[PDB]
Amino acid sequence: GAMNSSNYAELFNNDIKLFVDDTNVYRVTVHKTFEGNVATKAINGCIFTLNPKTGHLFLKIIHTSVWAGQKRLSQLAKWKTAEEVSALVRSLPKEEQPKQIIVTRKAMLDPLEVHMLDFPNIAIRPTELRLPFSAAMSIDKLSDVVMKATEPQMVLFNIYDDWLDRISSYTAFSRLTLLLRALKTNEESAKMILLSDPTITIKSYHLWPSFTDEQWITIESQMRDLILTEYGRKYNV
Amino acid sequence: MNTVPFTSAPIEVTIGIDQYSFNVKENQPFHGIKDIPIGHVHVIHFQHADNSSMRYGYWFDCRMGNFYIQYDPKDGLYKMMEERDGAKFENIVHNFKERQMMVSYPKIDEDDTWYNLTEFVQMDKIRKIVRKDENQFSYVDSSMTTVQENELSDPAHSLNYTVINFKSREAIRPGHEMEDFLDKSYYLNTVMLQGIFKNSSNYFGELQFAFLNAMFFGNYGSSLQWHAMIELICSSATVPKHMLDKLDEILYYQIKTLPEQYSDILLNERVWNICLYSSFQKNSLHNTEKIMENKYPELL
Numbered sequence: 001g002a003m004n005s006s007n008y009a010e011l012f013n014n015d016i017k018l019f020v021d022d023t024n025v026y027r028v029t030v031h032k033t034f035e036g037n038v039a040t041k042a043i044n045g046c047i048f049t050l051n052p053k054t055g056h057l058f059l060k061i062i063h064t065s066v067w068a069g070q071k072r073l074s075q076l077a078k079w080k081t082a083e084e085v086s087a088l089v090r091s092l093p094k095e096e097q098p099k100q101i102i103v104t105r106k107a108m109l110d111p112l113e114v115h116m117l118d119f120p121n122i123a124i125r126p127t128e129l130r131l132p133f134s135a136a137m138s139i140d141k142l143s144d145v146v147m148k149a150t151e152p153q154m155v156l157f158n159i160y161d162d163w164l165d166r167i168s169s170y171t172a173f174s175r176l177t178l179l180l181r182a183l184k185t186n187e188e189s190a191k192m193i194l195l196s197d198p199t200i201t202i203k204s205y206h207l208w209p210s211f212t213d214e215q216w217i218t219i220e221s222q223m224r225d226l227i228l229t230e231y232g233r234k235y236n237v
Numbered sequence: 238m239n240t241v242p243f244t245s246a247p248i249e250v251t252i253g254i255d256q257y258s259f260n261v262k263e264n265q266p267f268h269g270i271k272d273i274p275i276g277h278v279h280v281i282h283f284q285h286a287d288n289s290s291m292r293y294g295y296w297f298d299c300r301m302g303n304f305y306i307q308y309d310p311k312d313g314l315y316k317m318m319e320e321r322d323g324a325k326f327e328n329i330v331h332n333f334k335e336r337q338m339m340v341s342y343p344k345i346d347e348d349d350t351w352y353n354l355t356e357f358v359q360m361d362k363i364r365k366i367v368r369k370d371e372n373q374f375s376y377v378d379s380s381m382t383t384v385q386e387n388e389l390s391d392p393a394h395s396l397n398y399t400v401i402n403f404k405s406r407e408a409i410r411p412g413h414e415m416e417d418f419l420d421k422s423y424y425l426n427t428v429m430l431q432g433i434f435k436n437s438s439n440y441f442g443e444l445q446f447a448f449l450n451a452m453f454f455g456n457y458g459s460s461l462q463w464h465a466m467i468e469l470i471c472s473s474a475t476v477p478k479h480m481l482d483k484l485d486e487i488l489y490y491q492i493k494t495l496p497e498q499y500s501d502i503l504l505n506e507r508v509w510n511i512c513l514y515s516s517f518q519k520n521s522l523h524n525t526e527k528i529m530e531n532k533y534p535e536l537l
């Protein structure tokens with residue numbers, strides 16, 4: 001069944017689950033040709049597969065070579081996503097395989113179900129949550145590793161850094177989605193808030209700054225204010 | 238010509254025989270149906286006047302024996318029975334008083350509708366879908382579920398149609414996931430035609446049987462099967478030419494026979510829009526497309 005806000009805390013129980021977001025798999029720039037036409041050029045993409053309880057992100061880099069000589073790429077991209085997610089599940093030990101995979105876009109349902117036929121007890125579900133995982137490429141270290149790739153590549157991250165040492169998975173996911181929503185709403189301003197104190201650094205093995213508990217409270221308030229400010233600007237409120 | 242003798246008609250009922258129907262009143266002097274033509278297959282069906290719930294009926298081949306109908310006051314339905322003693326049957330069916338209380342099967346000579354609807358339907362295959370080996374005839378009703386439906390609860394009383402499931406390992410070769418889901422030719426040609434049905438005649442026969450069970454009994458699982466078998470062909474880029482041409486004829490006569498007021502429940506809008514306007518074989522169903530657009534434009 002579809003996931004939403006009534007059964008929201010279920011995301012953080014002990015049944016292993018993965019979110020899959022495909023919005024950055026097939027990425028293009030749009031430019032003008034010599035004849036005056038308009039042409040696309042693909043750039044490297046990624047699949048965003050996240051365990052919301054543990055923070056484990058399986059970032060599969062989609063190199064532009066996979067599109068070469070292929071037709072109907074937006075359709076193919078959904079099947080490619082499903083093929084790689086299935087391969088990921090097959091590569092995990094049984095006790096690490098998910099009980100549910102939640103896709104952020106309903107068009108991923110049939111491709112993933114078909115690729116997952118060998119796993120009949122893994123439920124494939126849409127969600128009614130509007131999740132901002134399309135802004136994953138606004139996280140600098142994720143964008144860097146995707147753009148530098150010269151071949152298909154799987155990169156592993158903990159998208160919560162060390163937060164679970166101090167807060168619950170529920171709270172960590174809420175912080176993640178607030179940060180990503182801010183980066184999706186006003187990327188340059190969200191990036192500014194996070195870099196504004198150069199003495200609070202990002203550890204080599206982290207994605208986000210080493211804020212104290214009180215600093216995170218301030219940062220989260222600044223991100224909420226950014227989102228509300230943009231809403232008012234957009235709707236003249 | 239063949240006769241279907243009725244011991245009596247104790248309860249008011251609408252009786253169908255093949256594509257025809259008439260009414261019998263409670264305790265009317267009714268002793269059955271005479272003058273039935275050439276019967277490779279026939280179906281006799283019932284809907285009680287005092288309780289339209291459960292339509293039910295019997296598929297039979299006059300060549301496989303002598304079939305009569307008798308009402309059972311305990312189970313409350315008209316039951317088909319076979320008589321092994323031919324002399325006795327010949328004697329009841331040739332009695333001119335009995336024959337005067339029988340309605341004549343009304344075959345217009347121009348009409349070929351019944352053999353267009355049932356050409357590929359065979360009793361031997363019906364009896365594998367409807368498993369009741371001690372009888373030469375086969376009971377179907379409005380409520381009987383299909384094996385597939387049961388897999389998603391009395392296996393004796395089930396419709397054992399060939400299971401068709403587009404998202405199953407049987408339909409999808411490992412390593413060909415996208416290919417086989419978008420083009421069902423493998424599933425049609427290798428799995429179904431070569432593997433299970435063996436030829437297109439057996440395929441069309443189950444398709445036609447499913448349609449007729451859906452129309453005559455309002456059997457939902459039969460309607461699902463009919464549409465599934467249509468969608469499997471239309472969603473295949475590679476289909477023998479003879480099979481496409483024959484499909485257009487088969488569907489044309491099914492749409493032509495369908496009651497006009499039954500389209501909101503016997504036709505699946507999604508499937509028919511895909512087959513007629515989006516599928517690989519859209520342009521291969523000219524006659525079906527033309528009758529659907531003029532007879533049932535609202536569905537499209």
Ligand SMILES: O=C(O)c1cnn(Cc2ccccc2)c1
Pocket residue numbers: 242243244245268305306320325326327329330335
């Ligand atoms: O057993 C048979 O051979 C048989 C033939 N007809 N019937 C039904 C019937 C019986 C009596 C009078 C009218 C019809 C049974």
